[PDB]
Design a protein around this ligand. Structure first.
Ligand SMILES: N[C@@H](CCCC[NH3+])C(=O)O
Length: 459
């Protein structure tokens, strides 16, 4: 009965946090980032499959890591127990300022856009709506996750079911248009491609960037029923599902659209629909909005638990490690994440904020893998229920080196401002965190007063 974040995330709610968070407005809108560089369908599908394989290697690394550690945080519990503190600190701080607020605000804006879109198919949706609809979405998901976490897993479940239904719809349309005929785009000179170290590297980067989120279940891993089984099994059931969904929906696309109008189109699914569904060409913008809703709910669960864990370790203020008394949901962490996402709804060029945290994000996943190897070396006696091999940590450490080098020479000043964000986090750690609580002024008294006032949100 004691205040503890009860588990209540089954295997199904495990597969829905990963699949949900993963397939979101990635293959729905301009997924041709792997087609611009691999200028052919055959090479495009080969690079989809290869990026999927390498994301599977990363997800198996994280299954082993999350069954080894059994602490939520998913990049912050694996840097904190392998390395120490400071690096974990600037992983919560990068996720606190730039990574999680921006990603949630962008998913909210992209949900608003494609909710409104069937009304404004050619005209661009206004900036007044498509930001107020985004704030309504963020606030609704924060409230749904703040009331009952079973509600939050339910929302995630429903909208992941919607995602998979819509993508099965487009995949079925593609297979139909392939069986009846219409196989000109496919299997005929399929690979008049652009084999080149630059182009192949950038297409692999775009694919491996498109399967992100495989580490979403690891954020909520103190709340899984028997994590030892349900975390690796849910990851290993989610990753082939999402890889298959990706390569099949791209097959469909290529079968219907063409190399020309599949580029130079804003949201290629909303092009595919216009070519096939006809009068029901609004279903696909509706499904992009639903998939963005599922992805936003998963981002909110994961970010709320990242900040909760971060404050439980002493990094974020105590007020953020607090459960609700009767509902058992991290109310102050969720309010904080919602505050941050809504603040980042006021920014105009947020899709420009993407790239800083892009480099930093893959850096931190890499540092977590490096920490897994550090633990394999230093403590080869910790109970690891699922210990696969070293081959997967090694290959995905290499793939992380690649995914970190690509945005460091392509656009370097942005990644430098990302490192600047982490450096800006540094002073709080070297001046507030590392203080042993008995050197701070009556700022402590203010902090405790505020923490009590916010304790008056659980009662
Ligand atoms: N992978 C999702 C984004 C969620 C990953 C977490 N930042 C996408 O492809 O759009």
């Amino acid at each position: 009965e004691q205040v503890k974040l009860k588990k209540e995330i089954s295997l199904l709610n495990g597969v829905c946090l990963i699949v949900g968070n993963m397939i979101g407005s990635g293959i729905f809108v301009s997924p041709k980032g792997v087609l611009i560089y691999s200028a052919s369908f055959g090479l495009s599908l080969v690079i989809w499959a290869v990026g999927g394989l390498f994301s599977v290697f990363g997800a198996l690394c994280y299954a082993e890591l999350g069954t080894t550690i059994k602490k939520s945080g998913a990049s912050y519990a694996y840097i904190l127990e392998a390395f120490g503190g400071f690096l974990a600190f600037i992983r919560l701080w990068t996720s606190l300022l730039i990574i999680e607020p921006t990603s949630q605000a962008i998913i909210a804006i992209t949900f608003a856009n494609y909710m409104v879109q069937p009304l404004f198919p050619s005209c661009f949706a206004p900036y007044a709506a498509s930001r107020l609809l985004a704030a309504a979405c963020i606030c609704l998901l924060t409230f749904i996750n703040c009331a009952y976490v079973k509600w939050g897993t339910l929302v995630q479940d429903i909208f992941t079911y919607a995602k998979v239904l819509a993508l099965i719809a487009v995949i079925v349309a593609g297979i139909v248009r392939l069986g009846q005929g219409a196989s000109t785009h496919f299997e005929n000179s399929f690979e008049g491609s652009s084999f080149a170290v630059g182009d192949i590297a950038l297409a692999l980067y775009s694919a491996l960037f498109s399967y992100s989120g495989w580490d979403t279940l690891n954020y909520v891993t103190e709340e899984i029923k028997n994590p030892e089984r349900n975390l690796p099994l849910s990851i290993g059931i989610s990753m082939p599902i999402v890889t298959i969904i990706y390569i099949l929906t791209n097959v469909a696309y290529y079968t219907v659209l063409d190399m020309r109008d599949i580029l130079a189109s804003d949201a290629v699914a909303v092009t595919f629909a216009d070519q096939i569904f006809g009068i029901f060409n609004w279903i696909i913008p509706l499904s992009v909005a639903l998939s963005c809703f599922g992805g936003l709910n998963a981002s909110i669960v994961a970010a709320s638990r990242l900040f909760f864990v971060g404050s439980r370790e002493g990094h974020l203020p105590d007020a953020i490690c607090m459960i609700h008394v009767e509902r058992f949901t991290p109310v102050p962490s969720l309010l904080f994440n919602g505050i941050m996402a809504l603040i980042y709804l006021c920014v105009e060029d947020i899709f420009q904020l993407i790239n800083y945290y892009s480099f930093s994000y893959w850096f931190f996943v890499g540092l977590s893998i490096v920490g897994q190897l550090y633990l394999r070396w230093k403590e080869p006696d910790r109970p690891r229920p699922l210990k696969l091999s070293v081959f997967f940590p090694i290959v995905f450490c290499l793939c992380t080196i690649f995914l970190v080098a690509v945005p460091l020479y392509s656009d370097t000043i942005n990644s430098l401002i990302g490192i600047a964000i982490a450096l800006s986090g540094l002073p709080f750690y070297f001046l507030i965190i590392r203080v042993p609580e008995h050197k701070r002024p009556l700022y402590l008294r203010r902090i405790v007063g505020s923490a009590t006032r916010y304790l008056q949100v659980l009662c």
